[PDB]
Design a protein around this nucleic acid. Structure first.
Ligand SMILES: [Mg+2]
Ligand code: NA
Ligand SMILES: [Zn+2]
Ligand SMILES: [Zn+2]
Length: 336
DNA sequence: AAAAA
DNA sequence: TTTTTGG
DNA sequence: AAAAAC
């Protein structure tokens, strides 16, 4: 059948038969992100995403016929990999000094595009030279990023994610006993690793005040146990944390783990769950499909119909998919 | 960079 | 061709 | 301004 240009109309499981092509496309996309070429970045991310959905490996140029998001530039890259098993374009990016510096600097929690560019233009090339510099001033986020660097750069596995789930649930039910805690992100899509562990917290009986106070109560509780290594609460309501995960719950005997908690009103739980499950590409295409194909607006809180001038209600992800005129895609099929 | 407008 | 690309 | 998210 006809492969859609939208990730939300494709089933993308973790069994990628085209990793040789998508690893090269992911490097080219990352370079364009670093060079602030948003458009070329998006074109390589879409091409990589569509190849990830294929139930077979590309073995010839003829196999690319009728596949969307594969223009002339992308087909040249695929042709080159079929030729000798390597991408000369991706190899050049991997050896580029700006690309190497941007990957290294942005690997620090609290360092993005602007700070990485600033440090590179100052002549810095290593994290050791940045940390030991007497003139540089670091944000509270960067201080935590450097202090827990080794732990944060190693990836979180499923036993660790589960151990964190237990800590989150134990803390949450202490203040809201009827609260529902769901692991979202990559782990909900079936990944066996991740950079962090994400949770959606919601309560069917909590008041507007109770809902607002929960993340402050849970983080104060952890601060008292000496488990809160970093905390930033944002406006729903969410927090970006670093938690101390003791070895015994799954050297120094503990591991720093990046955790994100999202508190949402009970009614909006389907929109939040859908938004936080991801992948990033699946979310982008859901919103793009809603706008361009249905004249609808979708976000983590709601679904709005621009023609009917009404907000559409949903108690489940299935209901959101049905409002959009999409076949339901399971979370493990959203790895776009 | 690719597809829609 | 010019505009959009999550937002 | 910057970073943090899927
Ligand atoms: Mg995650
Ligand atoms: Na970063
Ligand atoms: Zn996260
Ligand atoms: Zn909204």
């Amino acid at each position: 059948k006809k492969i859609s240009q939208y990730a939300c109309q494709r089933r993308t499981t973790l069994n990628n038969y085209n990793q040789l092509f998508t690893d090269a496309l992911d490097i080219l996309a990352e370079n364009d992100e670093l060079r602030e070429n948003e458009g070329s970045c998006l074109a390589f991310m879409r091409a990589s995403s569509v190849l990830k959905s294929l139930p077979f490996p590309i073995t010839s140029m003829k196999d690319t016929e009728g596949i969307p998001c594969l223009g002339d530039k992308v087909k040249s890259i695929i042709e080159g990999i079929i030729e000798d098993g390597e991408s000369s374009e991706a190899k050049a990016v991997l050896n580029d000094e700006r690309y190497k510096s941007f990957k290294l600097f942005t690997s620090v929690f609290g360092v993005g595009l602007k700070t990485a560019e600033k440090w590179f233009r100052m002549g810095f090339r290593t994290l050791s030279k940045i940390q030991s510099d007497k003139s540089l001033r670091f944000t509270q986020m960067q201080k935590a990023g450097f202090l827990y660097y080794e732990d944060l750069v190693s990836c979180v596995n499923r036993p660790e994610a589960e151990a964190v789930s237990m800590l989150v649930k134990e803390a949450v039910v202490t203040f809201l006993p009827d609260a529902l805690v769901t692991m979202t992100g990559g782990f909900r899509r079936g990944k066996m690793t991740g950079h962090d562990v994400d949770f959606l917290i919601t309560s069917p009986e909590a008041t507007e005040d109770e809902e607002q106070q929960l993340l402050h109560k849970v983080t104060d509780f952890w601060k008292q146990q000496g488990l809160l290594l970093y905390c930033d609460i944002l406006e729903a309501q969410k927090c970006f944390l670093i938690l101390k995960l003791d070895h015994g719950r799954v050297g120094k005997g503990w591991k720093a783990i990046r955790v994100d908690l999202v508190m949402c009103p009970y009614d909006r739980r389907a929109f939040a769950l859908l938004g936080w499950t991801g992948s990033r590409q699946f979310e982008r295409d859901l919103r793009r499909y809603a706008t361009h194909e249905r004249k609808m607006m979708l976000d983590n809180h709601a679904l709005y119909d621009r023609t009917k001038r009404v907000f559409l209600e949903a108690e489940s992800e299935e209901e959101i998919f049905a409002h959009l005129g999409l076949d339901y895609i399971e979370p493990w099929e959203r790895n776009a």
